[PDB]
């Protein structure tokens, strides 16, 4: 699988549980939220591609998804109880824990760098032709 493909299921399933109607609408989206979380935990983030399995950040990645399944684990057994309130009210910390693993400025100053080299080479070539061409 892929990290951000699991966040393609984890983002849109996170915003549906907040104001939802019945207890299965909590419970079906929580089964999407748990099962994509363990598959992302096996993965590797792309900015830490070249390291070891036993790196200090990669454990700090891999215990950093134990917190998120553990903060899935708060709203699991309340969702057996039929509480429409206590499921979504305990699940408000999921957006804070997406913020703590956002793991990107040094790559994006190649992308804005490369498009100007294919913009200024248009202007520098067509500008000289824009001067000299009616005398010749």
């Amino acid at each position, epitope marked *: 699988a892929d990290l951000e493909d699991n966040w393609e299921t984890l983002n849109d399933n996170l915003k549906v549980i907040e104001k939802a109607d019945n207890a299965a609408q909590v419970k079906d989206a929580l089964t999407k939220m748990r099962a994509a979380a*363990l598959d992302a935990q096996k993965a590797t983030p792309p900015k830490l591609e070249d390291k070891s399995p036993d790196s200090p950040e990669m454990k700090d990645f891999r215990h950093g998804f134990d917190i998120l399944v553990g903060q899935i684990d708060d709203a699991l057994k309340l969702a057996n109880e039929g509480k429409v309130k206590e499921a979504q009210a305990a699940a408000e910390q999921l957006k804070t824990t997406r913020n703590a693993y956002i793991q990107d400025w040094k790559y994006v100053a190649m992308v804005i760098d490369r498009i100007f080299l294919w913009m200024f080479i248009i202007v520098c070539l067509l500008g000289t032709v824009g001067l000299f061409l009616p005398p010749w």
Partner: antibody
Amino acid sequence: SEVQLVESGGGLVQPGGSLRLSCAASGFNVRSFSIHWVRQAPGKGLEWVAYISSSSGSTSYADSVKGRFTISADTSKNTAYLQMNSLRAEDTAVYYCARWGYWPGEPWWKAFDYWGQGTL
Amino acid sequence: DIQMTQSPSSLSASVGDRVTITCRASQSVSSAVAWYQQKPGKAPKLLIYSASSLYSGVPSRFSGSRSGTDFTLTISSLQPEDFATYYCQQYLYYSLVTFGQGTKVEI
């Protein structure tokens, strides 16, 4: 040195009635382990009944047994007590008690593996 | 729920031969498949936990394989001491645990 789990209490329920099942877990603790209960209707595959999480007392019943089943446990002598009210003959099954470890860790990935001798 | 489609329910194949057992889950389970050998009437035993890994005390002629939704128990040298009612089983969350219907080889 081994973890062992002993299933007992098997017999007849009078029709309409109730009965309590006992699982005695010898060798290990129950306060850091969820204990599940799983039956096998005969001539078939497998079909899960209910569970109890003894870290907080909490239990989950299936849609077969909601309203009719009630589990508790004693943490002193490592025992599980399952309460069966208003049964049927599709409950006439092989009953096993079961172990599961907790998140995080490799013992979460360790599934059901200590399966007992079974009661009818 | 998350149903579990066994294939096959029963089979009949030779001594020593390579036998495949496939199972397809009905929605996304990450890595949680456990496979079980079920002998006639005794205590059941676990062969495969985490969908491809051997149990600590199971022979290494058996193995498992996940590939997305496909979960497959492979038997290389199926000995005469090995016939059963086999089980794929999910273990995602404690209240939604479903089994397989079983795979019944006899020797």
